[PDB]
Amino acid sequence: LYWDDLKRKLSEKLDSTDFTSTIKLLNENSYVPREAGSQKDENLALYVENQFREFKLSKVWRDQHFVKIQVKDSAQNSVIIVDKNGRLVYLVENPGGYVAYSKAATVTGKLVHANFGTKKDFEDLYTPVNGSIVIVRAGKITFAEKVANAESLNAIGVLIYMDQTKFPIVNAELSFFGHAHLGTGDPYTPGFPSFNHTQFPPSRSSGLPNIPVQTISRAAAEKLFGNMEGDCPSDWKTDSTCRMVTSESKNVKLTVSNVLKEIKILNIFGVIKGFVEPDHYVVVGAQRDAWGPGAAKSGVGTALLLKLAQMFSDMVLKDGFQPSRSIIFASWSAGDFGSVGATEWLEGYLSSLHLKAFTYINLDKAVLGTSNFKVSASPLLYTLIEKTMQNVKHPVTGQFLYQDSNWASKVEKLTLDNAAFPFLAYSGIPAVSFCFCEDTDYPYLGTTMDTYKELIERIPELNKVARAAAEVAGQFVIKLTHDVELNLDYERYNSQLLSFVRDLNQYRADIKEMGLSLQWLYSARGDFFRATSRLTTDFGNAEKTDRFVMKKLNDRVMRVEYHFLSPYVSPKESPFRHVFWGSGSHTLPALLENLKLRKQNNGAFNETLFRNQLALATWTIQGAANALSGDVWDI
Amino acid sequence: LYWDDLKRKLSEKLDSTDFTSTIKLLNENSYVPREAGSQKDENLALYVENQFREFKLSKVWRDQHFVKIQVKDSAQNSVIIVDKNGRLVYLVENPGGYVAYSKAATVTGKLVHANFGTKKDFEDLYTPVNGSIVIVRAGKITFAEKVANAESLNAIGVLIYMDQTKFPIVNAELSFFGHAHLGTGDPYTPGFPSFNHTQFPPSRSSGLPNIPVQTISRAAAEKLFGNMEGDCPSDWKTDSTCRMVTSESKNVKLTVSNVLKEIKILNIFGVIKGFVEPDHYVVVGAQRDAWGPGAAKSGVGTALLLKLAQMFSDMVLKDGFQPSRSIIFASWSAGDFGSVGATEWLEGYLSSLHLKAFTYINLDKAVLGTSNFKVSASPLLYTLIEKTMQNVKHPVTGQFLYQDSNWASKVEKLTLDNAAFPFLAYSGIPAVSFCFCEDTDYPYLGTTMDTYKELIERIPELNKVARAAAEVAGQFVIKLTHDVELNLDYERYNSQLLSFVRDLNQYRADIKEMGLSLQWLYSARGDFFRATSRLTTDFGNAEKTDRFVMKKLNDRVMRVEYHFLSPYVSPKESPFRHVFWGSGSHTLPALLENLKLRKQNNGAFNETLFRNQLALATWTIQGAANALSGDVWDI
Amino acid sequence: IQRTPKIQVYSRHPAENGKSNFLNCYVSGFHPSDIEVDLLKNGERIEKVEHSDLSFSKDWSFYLLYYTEFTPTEKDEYACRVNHVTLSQPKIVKWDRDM
Amino acid sequence: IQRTPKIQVYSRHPAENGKSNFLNCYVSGFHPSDIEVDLLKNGERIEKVEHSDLSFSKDWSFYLLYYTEFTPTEKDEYACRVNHVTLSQPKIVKWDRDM
Amino acid sequence: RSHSLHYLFMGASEQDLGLSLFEALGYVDDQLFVFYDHESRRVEPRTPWVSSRISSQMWLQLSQSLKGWDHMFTVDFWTIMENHNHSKESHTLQVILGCEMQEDNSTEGYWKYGYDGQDHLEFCPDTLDWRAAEPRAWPTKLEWERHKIRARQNRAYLERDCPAQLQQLLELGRGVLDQQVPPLVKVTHHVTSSVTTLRCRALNYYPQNITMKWLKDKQPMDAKEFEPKDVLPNGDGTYQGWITLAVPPGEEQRYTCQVEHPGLDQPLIVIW
Amino acid sequence: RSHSLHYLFMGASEQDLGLSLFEALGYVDDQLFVFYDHESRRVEPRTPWVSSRISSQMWLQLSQSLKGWDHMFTVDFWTIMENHNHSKESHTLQVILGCEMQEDNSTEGYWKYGYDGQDHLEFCPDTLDWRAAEPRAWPTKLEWERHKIRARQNRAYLERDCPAQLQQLLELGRGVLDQQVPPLVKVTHHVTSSVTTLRCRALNYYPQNITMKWLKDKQPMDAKEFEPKDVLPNGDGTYQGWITLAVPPGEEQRYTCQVEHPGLDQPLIVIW
């Protein structure tokens, strides 16, 4: 039919689609609180699995996993002030919420206030954290990150709360949920699938914290603040109530008894087979589980997934749409515990996805506001994202999304809490996540107030905004499966490489001191650029009609994201091997992080680690280039 | 032209080819001793690089590496018999040969005699090896293995020699060369390429021995035997001269001063581009370097490489042969130090070979005798090897090579000293090695007597036997590039899987005790079988004329070998990831080796290690099956 | 549990001297499938003999059929000896002209 | 080493009142390419102005050309002020009717 | 009129030289059509209508299913021996599996294991489990039921695949598989002073089902008078059966032989 | 008659907001044909014969080469600033590279770097090295010469690619690139009591090469008498140049203006 026709078919299809009905339908007592592994979870899974069948998709199947999550024990968790002088006890709160994967323990000591728990915040702190409990604000980073940062500074226990400034909620007694696993997937099947074939060997994710972590209401935070001194830095721009450090006479005792619980997770899939190369495909997914009502955290996403799967089924069965490649629709569970369902899938079907699944689109938390439209994704999808922003209109402004021509240089990378993170960092599958959000975090996420009532009350034009989201996802899908060319712009990596070189000149002195050169890395990004040019040329001189020669060129494209996964580290111990977006010493940022230590001439800096870091990053890049250029003998 | 026509063209081409001339040409003072990195090496490299140009191949290029080998220092190495105070007493020998990568050191203690140094030989030894020097016979296994086995038993130093029984040589003063690196490639760039871009970071292969190892003449061995007691076990079927353990009053002092030396290696390549899918190819190679004359160890191989590259150039340019896929001819160097040139290539161009290079054929030591024709290779090449043996005739017997219909169940796996080993165990490229050999090891290998004079004198019908070798290699090449189907029989892996299951029932009791089941592993080999069947079916129902649908199926085939590389270990620390033919705990044999320890109920057995070994081997297999069966949704 | 064979000798068509017929020996109900059978003529083992495919019945007992083309005379005697593990000496069964 | 611009005002065709011509201002030889130029009419900056592409000569000195379509009269005065870092105040150069 | 497809597998431990211990037999409507042998593990046809009418495609599927079952049963055999502490012993494992399709097309499936010639495990599709025929079978019973996968797969085969392949085989057979040939009945008789024995042979017929009973004075005698028909096989897909009757020396002619067979219109009555 | 192709690059440090600091100019026979800008990093054409005659293919190659050079030079600029300990300072880097093809087709290539407006490094193809124009350039000189790759690549471009692309541009130009228009010479003159000044303008011509000299009494004066021709540009690919001469009030008519130009058959001599 051609882009313009597809664009229109999709558009009209959307205009007559009621997202509001679906989102609201997903908030009925039938699926109210849907914690991963719960009946309500399973119910919603069956509902979706059935909708897929109704939509009559090429095939609809499900995967079943047995994973270990953590729930609160029969014994209440608590935060109590223990009065040194005469061991008198206060009792600040018996929290309704909790942090999954916190260590079960009970500790007590001084309560120091870090801020957000950022690695930097601890750095600029005055009071040493060593040996005491830390209290931090939700935001800026992951709980797991906060807890991991505190633990590396020998803190004991972490208390997390929502200040009224960042989280302007009325009810200060409101509690919330989160997980502290510094990773993704079932933390007890690290780097491998939670399948009975595995006979679940004793394996413990190194991302599991070794100190307790608890969630407390704002009220509780203020009560603790009534026993602390020292005005909270104005720099923090936070409540006029907080203060750091407790009065020498008083200290707190945190006690959490959370227990592990093995559960059954269900991942529901649906595929629309392609018409030319069905073996290659796109994956579109959304989280189904939620701690509370999860309207915004789970509903909107799942609603979008259902609709999209429907519209594309029609377009294919009615409007005669004929995607060359397949489209998979997936509803995952245990996302609240760290994109578990999704990670287990990727680790389970690794060999089947390799160079076959070529892009992932996440639909979670797609609608949280109206003011902005943010995006996080592999550079390979920037151009596609751009073109899409140029032809899609803001649900309220009526204007085009493309309003800033420098948007690409402001793109924030994918984070651990995003289901797209595993796909890109571990699988090597270019992924993307986007939202119509605000400059403020959607306050109710992870709380009991994340309900439809609140969602629409906050954003009344929900249905229209949901439509806009559906439209951008819809277009990504069309563009990616529509015709002979994959809209994956590998040229975008030249800017990332150059930027790494820029991040590196401040350390040219150090490199020089170690008697090393940056010339080989420099010539590497050079050779990559050459390679991209050679490939774009090959496309240019090709007859877009010869489906064979075009297959060959697109193969080179699908391998680009993959070749940035480090071939020198263990996928089990370091799943996030992508040298640009992963985690670990094999990472490019990690190379810089080490080099930064060489400033304060004291231990920290590991030179042999660095000399190796450099040798490998350099070659991982030259290699990516030599492959992109095609045929060994033509290098 | 079709198989039968190609078969004939090749045949006649061969009949008029003079291998003898080439082998002899490779033994002229011009390239007499060609140690890796030497001028004579470089000379022979240029000769070959030029012959490739003369043959007018699609393209001929060269790779240049800077690797660290080890040579003997200006100070002589020595073996001396000493008196309890360190006093000089006998001085057995100042060896002409040496063992590359031995530790530079000087030690002294009692000299115990192990046999061949096999892990078992040490096991059944009476005298403890702990704390003393060991003496062993060349054979059965690698020097590196011998040295590694001795070192794990706390031995110090190892002396290696050739007994007159296994090695019936006249001159007992004859010395020999070898290397003790338990691995492949430049041991100082483990798991990565020896390229200046690397800036050679400090990295040391964990396969480098930490004790000295020296080579001694038979004469010397007998002199040491004159100071030892205890008749050498008749079971060993060795010289009537050896004895184990020295007289309590006497002990030996081994002293080796070998030094590292950085050298420049040259890998010369030549390719014959394919006519349909040039991006896919076969690699055929041979070692060029040699410690002495290296007639048999290097000459024959390189001679075969030159001829083969010629014949196929003609066939393509004259006889109008049109291979669908490419053919690469490679002459590597530093093979004597552990297939270094070849390994550096694989580690260097990893990303370019992935799923592109689909088979490797090694030509080293192809002719060592006449009596037998042995073969070592991936099961995927068994059928091809079989058919080839059924239509190729023994150079002397005149009969067909296929004489035993159970040959396949007697195939010995590839070993560290074989250049094909890295290709299969590290790269995931099905590889093969073969020879017209004897039941006796070619005595002169690694000595100064491995010359043409000796080679032809021992096997006078050299030219005819060399032709037979060239013919089997030639046919492999045709078969692999000739038509639409890759002659890679993935069904052969069902027999390997079943055999693993057989090797495992002796431990069903142990498995049961640990509360584990073997049912999931059982169902895994089941699912693999199903998968192979489904793929053979898909081929059956396919029009061998639709080059597109045939590409898709062959892709599934090329991924078979690759999916057996463990996705759970680090390629840098454990390069040989192939769970069937690699080395390391991720290996299938390793799983058995651990299980065997559970017999003698004492420490040794690591249960958690095992529970993990099982979980991963099981899933690596189910995964290979789920991928082989095609399309995730169709599982 | 082991089981001894059940030997049954007979002809394809009613015996009629001079007319080339067929001599059958049909062992059944025996267990360890491992069994040997020979068709004798005047006490001599006949060559050019044929047999069907070994198979078994519901009770897991095996059964096999041997048969040779032959021309009957009143002078010649026919019988098959069956050797199994459940038998001391190779049990012989002669061919009763009537059956 | 910094370099001050060289301002040259002139016309495309010989000045001839009433006839729409072209007023050029061509700065050259200046270094820090960063430079601003305005074409004045009776002391006022003219809009709808055009300019070529910044470029440079062998000595790495930059040069740029500005030009507007205009109709000359003996009443009106034309000149361009060039502001560079090498100048205290924006140097002005009036258009000499003769050139 | 119900049709059936079923395979038979038989293996022995001690005897062999290279893993994979089973030989197999394929039967469609009790008609041997395929044979997987020991030596040169290959799938040869039995009966001309299959060694010609069977497409190259179907034969591949057949070959694989048989080689697969070989491997699968070889594992099971090893499993079962080991759960009996058997090893230095020579044992046998036999398996029979197939489906039976009724006129209305409904299907019934079965899968049985016979250890050393005796019932061991019987697969029960409706409950995804197995029933141990004897105590020593319980270990294996449990070991298989923990897995869960095995049962679901076995059921899938019996419920989906088997029936499907039976269909293909039938259409492919219409002609030589339902081609029924009538019997050539011949009443003979051996005489002695003791008594006179009557032998009624039904020659060269097909299929195997047939009815043979004696008639005294042209009337139906009781089944107790004679032994049941003795069906025998000829090395050519044809069978022959006979029934004997001892009668008072002289009353010969008083007895007749009645032979009912689908290959005959009305029941044939023979007299010597 | 030798042709030339050369690109010009110019970047400033302090000013910008997103790495990649260069703008570029492409010239074929001193004819601007392409421009790579700062804002919206895109490659726009200059002159109609390119914005039409240049194939979609060639333009791609051109766009990439320019974006590439941008990136490559951006790195070099960073390198050079750092080897000067420069950072919180605003500097400039300029590069000129191209090839010049002679009548016999032989080619000469060049590549030069200008740091802060002054010669810094000059690439020498015949020796695969660079020559530092000043002491502070030596660090970079050495740093690039260790690499070895850089030089070989730069040479490859100048020797192989550049010449090749110049060819394509010429064939593609035959018509509007060699289309030379003659000048419209006009001798004017301003008078005063002091003296009378004569101005000889050569209007709207192309190319730029032209000859303008004064003639006293129809004879050749010395070059010392007047300043060299002052070539100026018009915003339309046409140029104009003038020469001035001061002469004794009254002798006006005694002087003439001679203008030689390839766009004219015989040298034009103008008189006011």
Ligand SMILES: *[C@@H]1O[C@H](CO)[C@@H](O)[C@H](O)[C@H]1NC(C)=O
């Ligand atoms: C898989 O394992 C889990 C936990 O070990 C267990 O609860 C569940 O019943 C098992 N499921 C199957 C099908 O074996």
Ligand SMILES: *[C@@H]1O[C@H](CO)[C@@H](O)[C@H](O)[C@H]1NC(C)=O
């Ligand atoms: C590479 O390094 C080796 C020694 O490490 C040296 O001899 C050689 O010249 C170097 N080559 C380059 C291009 O730096």
Ligand SMILES: [Ca+2]
């Ligand atoms: Ca997992």
Ligand SMILES: [Ca+2]
């Ligand atoms: Ca290496």
